[PDB]
Design a protein around this motif. Structure first.
Motif, PDB file in Angstrom:
ATOM      1  N   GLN A 145       0.817  -1.209   0.000  1.00 17.76           N
ATOM      2  CA  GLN A 145       0.000   0.000   0.000  1.00 17.76           C
ATOM      3  C   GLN A 145       0.854   1.264   0.000  1.00 17.76           C
ATOM      4  N   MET A 146       1.928   1.250   0.783  1.00 18.33           N
ATOM      5  CA  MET A 146       2.855   2.373   0.814  1.00 18.33           C
ATOM      6  C   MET A 146       3.426   2.634  -0.577  1.00 18.33           C
ATOM      7  N   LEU A 147       3.927   1.580  -1.211  1.00 18.37           N
ATOM      8  CA  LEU A 147       4.534   1.699  -2.531  1.00 18.37           C
ATOM      9  C   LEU A 147       3.524   2.136  -3.593  1.00 18.37           C
ATOM     10  N   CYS A 148       2.268   1.725  -3.435  1.00 12.25           N
ATOM     11  CA  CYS A 148       1.218   2.159  -4.350  1.00 12.25           C
ATOM     12  C   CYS A 148       1.016   3.665  -4.241  1.00 12.25           C
ATOM     13  N   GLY A 149       0.899   4.154  -3.011  1.00 16.30           N
ATOM     14  CA  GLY A 149       0.714   5.576  -2.781  1.00 16.30           C
ATOM     15  C   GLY A 149       1.892   6.371  -3.311  1.00 16.30           C
ATOM     16  N   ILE A 150       3.097   5.874  -3.041  1.00 14.73           N
ATOM     17  CA  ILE A 150       4.321   6.530  -3.489  1.00 14.73           C
ATOM     18  C   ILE A 150       4.402   6.630  -5.012  1.00 14.73           C
ATOM     19  N   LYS A 151       4.065   5.544  -5.701  1.00 17.97           N
ATOM     20  CA  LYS A 151       4.116   5.531  -7.161  1.00 17.97           C
ATOM     21  C   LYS A 151       3.151   6.559  -7.738  1.00 17.97           C
ATOM     22  N   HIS A 152       1.968   6.642  -7.143  1.00 19.59           N
ATOM     23  CA  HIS A 152       0.957   7.593  -7.579  1.00 19.59           C
ATOM     24  C   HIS A 152       1.470   9.017  -7.399  1.00 19.59           C
ATOM     25  N   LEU A 153       2.072   9.282  -6.245  1.00 17.30           N
ATOM     26  CA  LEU A 153       2.674  10.583  -5.980  1.00 17.30           C
ATOM     27  C   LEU A 153       3.712  10.928  -7.043  1.00 17.30           C
ATOM     28  N   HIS A 154       4.601   9.982  -7.323  1.00 14.77           N
ATOM     29  CA  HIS A 154       5.658  10.196  -8.307  1.00 14.77           C
ATOM     30  C   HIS A 154       5.098  10.474  -9.699  1.00 14.77           C
ATOM     31  N   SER A 155       4.078   9.716 -10.093  1.00 20.28           N
ATOM     32  CA  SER A 155       3.458   9.909 -11.400  1.00 20.28           C
ATOM     33  C   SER A 155       2.826  11.292 -11.481  1.00 20.28           C
TER      34      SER A 155
ATOM     35  N   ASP B  58       1.093  14.559   4.007  1.00 22.72           N
ATOM     36  CA  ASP B  58       2.269  15.423   4.144  1.00 22.72           C
ATOM     37  C   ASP B  58       3.263  15.292   2.985  1.00 22.72           C
ATOM     38  N   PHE B  59       2.797  15.546   1.765  1.00 22.12           N
ATOM     39  CA  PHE B  59       3.622  15.422   0.559  1.00 22.12           C
ATOM     40  C   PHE B  59       4.995  16.103   0.669  1.00 22.12           C
ATOM     41  N   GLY B  60       5.624  15.992   1.838  1.00 20.16           N
ATOM     42  CA  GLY B  60       6.937  16.567   2.079  1.00 20.16           C
ATOM     43  C   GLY B  60       6.872  18.037   2.443  1.00 20.16           C
TER      44      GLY B  60
ATOM     45  N   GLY C 207       4.164  13.851 -10.328  1.00 11.86           N
ATOM     46  CA  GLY C 207       5.272  14.790 -10.271  1.00 11.86           C
ATOM     47  C   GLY C 207       5.573  15.263  -8.861  1.00 11.86           C
ATOM     48  N   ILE C 208       5.292  14.407  -7.883  1.00 12.62           N
ATOM     49  CA  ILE C 208       5.492  14.745  -6.478  1.00 12.62           C
ATOM     50  C   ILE C 208       6.391  13.725  -5.796  1.00 12.62           C
ATOM     51  N   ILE C 209       7.595  14.146  -5.431  1.00 14.54           N
ATOM     52  CA  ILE C 209       8.493  13.287  -4.670  1.00 14.54           C
ATOM     53  C   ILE C 209       8.440  13.684  -3.198  1.00 14.54           C
ATOM     54  N   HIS C 210       8.081  12.733  -2.341  1.00 12.72           N
ATOM     55  CA  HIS C 210       7.804  13.034  -0.938  1.00 12.72           C
ATOM     56  C   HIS C 210       9.042  13.510  -0.179  1.00 12.72           C
ATOM     57  N   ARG C 211      10.050  12.642  -0.091  1.00 14.06           N
ATOM     58  CA  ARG C 211      11.339  12.972   0.520  1.00 14.06           C
ATOM     59  C   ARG C 211      11.347  12.980   2.056  1.00 14.06           C
TER      60      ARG C 211
ATOM     61  N   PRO D  43      -2.701   9.608 -12.091  1.00 11.60           N
ATOM     62  CA  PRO D  43      -3.214  10.746 -11.320  1.00 11.60           C
ATOM     63  C   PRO D  43      -3.989  11.717 -12.208  1.00 11.60           C
ATOM     64  N   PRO D  44      -4.955  12.443 -11.624  1.00 13.37           N
ATOM     65  CA  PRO D  44      -5.802  13.389 -12.359  1.00 13.37           C
ATOM     66  C   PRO D  44      -5.012  14.572 -12.907  1.00 13.37           C
ATOM     67  N   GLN D  45      -3.845  14.833 -12.330  1.00  9.99           N
ATOM     68  CA  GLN D  45      -3.024  15.967 -12.737  1.00  9.99           C
ATOM     69  C   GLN D  45      -1.547  15.717 -12.471  1.00  9.99           C
ATOM     70  N   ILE D  46      -0.700  16.424 -13.209  1.00 10.33           N
ATOM     71  CA  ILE D  46       0.722  16.470 -12.908  1.00 10.33           C
ATOM     72  C   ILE D  46       1.060  17.833 -12.315  1.00 10.33           C
ATOM     73  N   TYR D  47       1.671  17.829 -11.135  1.00 12.21           N
ATOM     74  CA  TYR D  47       2.081  19.069 -10.490  1.00 12.21           C
ATOM     75  C   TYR D  47       3.095  19.812 -11.350  1.00 12.21           C
ATOM     76  N   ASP D  48       2.843  21.096 -11.569  1.00 13.22           N
ATOM     77  CA  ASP D  48       3.724  21.923 -12.383  1.00 13.22           C
ATOM     78  C   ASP D  48       4.711  22.671 -11.491  1.00 13.22           C
ATOM     79  N   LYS D  49       5.968  22.237 -11.514  1.00  9.33           N
ATOM     80  CA  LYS D  49       6.993  22.798 -10.637  1.00  9.33           C
ATOM     81  C   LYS D  49       7.238  24.290 -10.864  1.00  9.33           C
ATOM     82  N   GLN D  50       6.662  24.839 -11.930  1.00  7.71           N
ATOM     83  CA  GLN D  50       6.778  26.269 -12.203  1.00  7.71           C
ATOM     84  C   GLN D  50       6.129  27.085 -11.089  1.00  7.71           C
ATOM     85  N   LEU D  51       5.158  26.484 -10.411  1.00 11.43           N
ATOM     86  CA  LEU D  51       4.489  27.154  -9.307  1.00 11.43           C
ATOM     87  C   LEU D  51       5.473  27.493  -8.191  1.00 11.43           C
TER      88      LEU D  51
END
Lengths: 10, 340
Positions: B128-138, B163-165, B140-144, B312-320
């Motif tokens: 379950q952890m790895l599932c959540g993590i993969k979704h986060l990564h897809s 707490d997405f980091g 564009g969110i790396i927890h850290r 995921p429904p969206q990719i986070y845009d790091k430009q923000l």
């Protein structure tokens, strides 16, 4: 196997 | 007001939709105040976070907006979601308070970790952890910053990340080497953290406890061994000067680090240990990826295409991250997200 459905938090 | 009612929570006034009842404080900021509550419409328990002074300054405003967009980038059962967002104010002009509603879970991983777990619960929680993590990564969110205190569970053995980091555990113990040595990181930075958590589930003790980063590095090398030269070359000269001149450690073998006695199949034990030996790898270039961890025999038993491959429904845009606005501009952006 089937997935666990219980988790004892104590 | 009509759809709303007010509850005094200490010195704070919670004005919430009438669907939310039985409020009581369970956390406080800093960033805001959190109440456990019953949602009579969903017949479910929820957490309601009131943002603290989101419009005090540009820093607060940007942060508030960012949290809102991050939550919209994610839609997965192994990640905390935004069930609702509202304000009791009726116009942009008087818009002041922002309320976030998410699932109420039963506890974090801290104590679950200290107790005996069969391989089934261990691997399923990690899956379950790895599932959540993969979704986060897809997305564009790396927890850290993954750790026992920011991973929560229910008595039905379900798990979600936030707490997405309480209990509280400082990050650091669970942070990857590339982070503590300031080398930069990629997706698999989160795998090290999973490795630390898995290793702790196995022996009910923090793998790498250090008073500070420097002492952390020591616990790491004492157990895993001094990294190769090609790794120490990636280090900035000041860090390299310190690291390269420590006593040299060969590292303890994984059978020694996690002996059978700590486990309940002898097969499952060897598999867990093999996975640990691939996650707890100092050099990120040699560390197992999320996709490979999910496919590992210890984990793959639980595989479900819908849980692993769900985009995921969206990719986070790091430009923000580099964008700036005045307070009022951020506020209008936030008001729009809220009213949507």
């Amino acid at each position: 196997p089937k997935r666990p459905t219980t988790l004892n938090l104590f | 007001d009509n759809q709303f009612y007010s509850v005094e929570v200490g010195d704070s006034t919670f004005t919430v939709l009438k669907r939310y009842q039985n409020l009581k404080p369970i956390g406080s900021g800093a960033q805001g105040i959190v109440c456990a509550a019953y949602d009579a419409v969903l017949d479910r328990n929820v957490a309601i976070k009131k943002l603290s002074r989101p419009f005090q300054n540009q820093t607060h405003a940007k942060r508030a907006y960012r949290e809102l967009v991050l939550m919209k980038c994610v839609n997965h059962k192994n990640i905390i979601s935004l069930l609702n967002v509202f304000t009791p104010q009726k116009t942009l002009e008087e818009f002041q308070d922002v309320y976030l509603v998410m699932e109420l879970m039963d506890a974090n991983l801290c104590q679950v970790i200290q107790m005996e777990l069969d391989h089934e619960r261990m691997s399923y929680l990690l899956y379950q952890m790895l599932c959540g993590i993969k979704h986060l990564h897809s997305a564009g969110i790396i927890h850290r910053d993954l750790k026992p205190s920011n991973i929560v569970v229910k008595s039905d053995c379900t798990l979600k990340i936030l707490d997405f980091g309480t209990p509280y555990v400082v990050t650091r113990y669970y942070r990857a080497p590339e982070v503590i040595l300031g080398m930069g990181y990629k997706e698999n930075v989160d795998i090290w953290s999973v490795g630390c958590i898995m290793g702790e589930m196995v022996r009910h003790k923090i793998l790498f406890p250090g008073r500070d980063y420097i002492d952390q590095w020591n616990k790491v090398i004492e157990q895993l061994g001094t990294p190769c030269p090609e790794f120490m070359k990636k280090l900035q000269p000041t860090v390299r000067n310190y690291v390269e001149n420590r006593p040299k450690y060969a590292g303890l073998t994984f059978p020694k680090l996690f002996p059978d006695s700590l486990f309940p199949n002898k097969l499952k034990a060897s598999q867990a240990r093999d996975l640990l030996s691939k996650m707890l790898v100092i050099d990120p270039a040699k560390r197992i990826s999320v996709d490979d961890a999910l496919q590992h025999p210890y984990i793959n038993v639980w595989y479900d295409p819908a849980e692993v491959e769900a985009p995921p429904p969206q990719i986070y845009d790091k430009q923000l991250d580099e964008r700036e606005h005045t307070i009022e501009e951020w506020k209008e952006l936030i008001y729009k997200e809220v009213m949507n």
